[PDB]
Design a protein around this nucleic acid. Structure first.
Lengths: 441, 116, 441
DNA sequence: ATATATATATATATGTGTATATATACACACATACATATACATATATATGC
DNA sequence: GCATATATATGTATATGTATGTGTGTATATATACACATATATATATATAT
């Protein structure tokens, strides 16, 4: 019946503390490695689940939203498909995670449509930066069917813009440019003095000016005449709707401006006829300062770097170069683990192939005789041979077209093929394959 | 949906003013319902019967049905707006009996109207 | 830049007529043989594709709505999960085809549940009624992965009630009793007198009486005292809030009755005290009729049958029995076609079983052996043999443990099992196998 | 000379479709602004001072 | 008749302290308004009749 007193210290420091822990570590944060929040990890994980069969078939977002609870998801699917709608932009994101098919909006509109018109599939850039995913660190919860995280060669958290918001903490990161971060991970691999990558925005002709830990994103404007006006770019936090509603309309119902549209292949083209009772400054620097004060073309942004590490704990940073270097020193350990484990399996494969090839060379008029004798006799007599110690199940699952001469030379050449693959993956190390998977862009 | 329900109901709405019909200022935009990849190129089909008449003659393909503009891409929209296709909507002299036959609340008009 | 004069008459005769026939066949009215909507065929086809692995796993209603466009659905999916949500109940339908998991409802709530809370799987009733569905007639559209119609052994549309409403046309059929339809199709098998089946509505402890085409669905009340009374069953077209706001709320405003909750586990329980202003007769028959009319415990209903044949056009039936015997004759024809096809396959698998048995008996003991030869000339040598012809491809890809003598007899005994199944299915008819189908219940 | 018998178009309502929207907590650590006021300098002026 | 002086009033320019964000999505649920028709029902409007 349990009429128990549950006191408020117990209520807060157990239940609300666990709720706060879920917000800070399993709802809001992306890791420094993959750049994915856990609902994003769910989205790309079920994108890999539906990526089998063809890499060019297009799939419904609701088809991801259907069986996401198989992987360990226990919330509403609408937030998941709207998250995938954000990674279906390629205008709010510099790095295209998924190829898409449908109406995805532009710079001028920001609200994505519902799932009912939208097809999506895995992009190639996934396959450029994510590889070797069977070595991913398996999560501590058993029904957490995706791992802890995946294997990128890059920190993707700095490529598309992260706003991470939870109980207590908050974080914000701007996107960057692909060649800048590519030469950055070259220079951080080599151990030289690492250069800062350039912050890039997609589909955007504005200018990012970096002063005192401060990003001035500047929209563009041009004086076509003295009075007539053409703003061609607006800053990135504004779209066409709020530039109309909070800038163009409040100055339009004050008798100073009359705005109109002049867009095209680029959006945000507003042609503004100023009115005769509004003062045009002949001092052009005062004109520039007042047009920055009123039209608000300079958007100033300050970043915030708080991250969960590879160990599952909070870490506060101030520079992006330290995130690159931490990514490199974290990643190289698992690269070396992959190298050693790959050596183990490639050897097991070579001894398996040499065992089955030398088996077939001892079958064709050989001492291993199959007719007239039962199953158990052959399993025991091949089990007593040490070079058929634990392989005899796939020797017996083998079929009779492994009897001719051509297959015997085929088994021999494939055994020496994985022998030279065994030696080739035995010689190499972290750095030259990391150089290779970097240069596969 | 569109060309069968919001089309004739808004034409019955517009039937109070025929002067814009003989001004020719009403222009229906014919929109594709199937975009099909054949070889490398694409083919457009406006209605389902246009596809079904030419389904057997066209070779193996990969189609995409179009439910509306939310499935249409950027370049497809810019092609159908910078090279548009219009049906000029002309009212006949017997528009009133057609709109009563097709928009009146009697179901029997819809009964022997479909029986021919 | 196209301009074409477009007249209203051809606009009507093409697209308004297309909308009319689309609302008739593809939106409202089911086909008479199986009683499914096309969107309902999409729902149970997605149930097949979801439960291809396991019958007992419970899928989400979002999961039954997820991957629907690849099978040929091209319309608003929200109607598809709401149509799925309006079938897996135990209370609106006598005969569910889907086991539910969650509060799908009772008679006390008419609203369907959300797509965020309820799981579902297929019922056993799919495995009781719907058989040999590999022989379903192939739809004319290649994109239509569900068939033209499914394969029922019963008129399913009578069992749960269907309200179809389209462009100038209406139809309504009502639910019935399972043993009544069962003995009706038993009489329709044997050419006997077919009784029109008894109408049953589930969770309804009242009764339905047929009066000259009208159907009276009766709510039940009982005199607790002279002024006290208890309503125990109400008609299904009144919900709890509908009986409150349509009867009980427009009776306390006029000061007639007084009502309170007594809804037990059986169903719609209310307790009503009659006020002194609402006078009742001393004779109980006009008092009973006055209470029976004022409380609205009568549900009048009328029938309409405008249903769809296999030839893609309409058909109007006056009653149940004509549709029953039309179902019987089309089921007899298609079951005769499916047993002729079974004869074709039962002799083909005999031919393959005797060929593989004789082939193994010559491989063990004979000149037909393989030893470091050329796979291709071996297959051509088997192509010289007339009864090794057309089966040479899987014979080279056939396992070595058949080479042991434990399975060389096993192939022969399984061929004997084929023999007895072959001339077992050479003697069967329509009527005894469909008699087995009816006694499976 | 109005009481009442009666007839007929109002109100759900069923399911299918096809589409919208909306109140909130989360939090930094600034972003833009909303006035805003407020104290102080200096100008002129005029009326005192001479 | 003219020096002059200081007084306060209003520009003015900055520096305060607040105030409103919404950010940017995640997350939770809910609401909305139409087209497709017969079947009752109901309720009150008119006739008449003594």
């Amino acid at each position: 019946m349990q009429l128990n007193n549950r006191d408020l210290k117990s209520i807060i420091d157990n239940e609300a503390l666990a709720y706060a822990m879920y917000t800070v570590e399993n709802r809001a944060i992306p890791n420094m490695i993959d750049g994915f929040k856990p609902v994003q990890r769910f989205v790309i994980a079920r994108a890999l689940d539906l990526a089998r069969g063809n890499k060019d078939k297009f799939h419904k977002l609701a088809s991801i939203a259907g069986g996401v609870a198989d992987l360990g998801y226990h919330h509403g699917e609408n937030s998941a498909q709207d998250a995938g709608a954000l990674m279906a932009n390629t205008w709010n994101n510099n790095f295209p995670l998924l190829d898409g098919q449908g109406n995805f909006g532009s710079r001028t509109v920001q609200k994505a449509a519902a799932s009912r018109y939208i097809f999506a599939r895995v992009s190639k850039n996934f396959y450029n930066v994510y590889k070797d995913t069977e070595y991913a660190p398996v999560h501590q919860d058993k029904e957490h069917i995706p791992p802890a995280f995946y294997l990128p060669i890059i920190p993707t958290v700095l490529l598309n813009g992260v706003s991470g918001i939870a109980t207590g903490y908050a974080t914000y990161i701007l996107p960057h440019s692909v060649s800048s971060v590519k030469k950055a991970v070259l220079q951080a691999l080599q151990g030289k003095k690492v250069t800062k990558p350039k912050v890039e925005f997609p589909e955007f002709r504005g200018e990012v000016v970096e002063i005192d830990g401060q990003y001035e994103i500047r929209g563009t404007y041009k004086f076509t005449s003295r009075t007539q006006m053409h703003i061609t770019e607006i800053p990135y936090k504004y779209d066409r709707e709020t530039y109309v509603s909070k800038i163009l309309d409040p100055l339009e119902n004050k008798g100073f401006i009359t705005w109109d549209d002049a867009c095209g292949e680029h959006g945000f083209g507003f042609k503004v006829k100023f009115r005769k009772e509004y003062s045009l400054s002949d001092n052009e620097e005062e004109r520039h300062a007042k047009i920055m004060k009123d039209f608000g073309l300079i958007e100033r942004r300050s970043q915030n770097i708080t991250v969960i590490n590879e160990k599952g704990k909070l870490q506060v940073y101030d520079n992006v170069v330290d995130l690159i270097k931490d990514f490199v020193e974290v990643r190289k350990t698992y690269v070396q683990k992959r190298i050693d484990n790959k050596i183990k399996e490639t050897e097991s494969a070579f001894r398996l192939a040499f065992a089955k090839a030398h088996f077939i060379k001892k079958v064709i008029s050989g001492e291993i005789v199959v007719q007239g004798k039962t199953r158990k006799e052959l399993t025991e007599e091949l089990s007593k041979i040490d070079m058929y110690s634990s392989y005899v199940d796939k020797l017996v699952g083998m079929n009779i077209f492994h009897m001719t001469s051509d297959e015997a030379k085929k088994l021999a050449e494939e055994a020496k093929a994985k022998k030279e693959e065994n030696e080739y993956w035995k010689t190499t190390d972290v750095v030259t394959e990391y150089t290779k998977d970097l240069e596969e862009i | 949906d569109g060309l069968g329900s919001i089309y004739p109901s808004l034409l019955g709405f517009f039937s109070n003013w025929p002067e814009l019909f003989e001004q020719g200022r009403i222009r229906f935009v014919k929109t594709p319902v199937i975009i099909a990849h054949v070889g490398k190129k694409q083919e457009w089909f406006y209605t389902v019967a246009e596809y079904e008449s030419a389904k057997d003659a066209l070779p193996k393909h990969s189609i995409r049905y179009i439910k509306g503009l939310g499935s249409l891409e950027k370049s497809e929209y810019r092609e159908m707006i910078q090279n548009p296709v219009y049906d000029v909507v002309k009212l006949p002299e017997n528009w009133k009996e057609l709109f009563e036959m097709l928009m009146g609340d009697n179901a029997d008009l819809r009964k022997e109207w479909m029986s021919q």
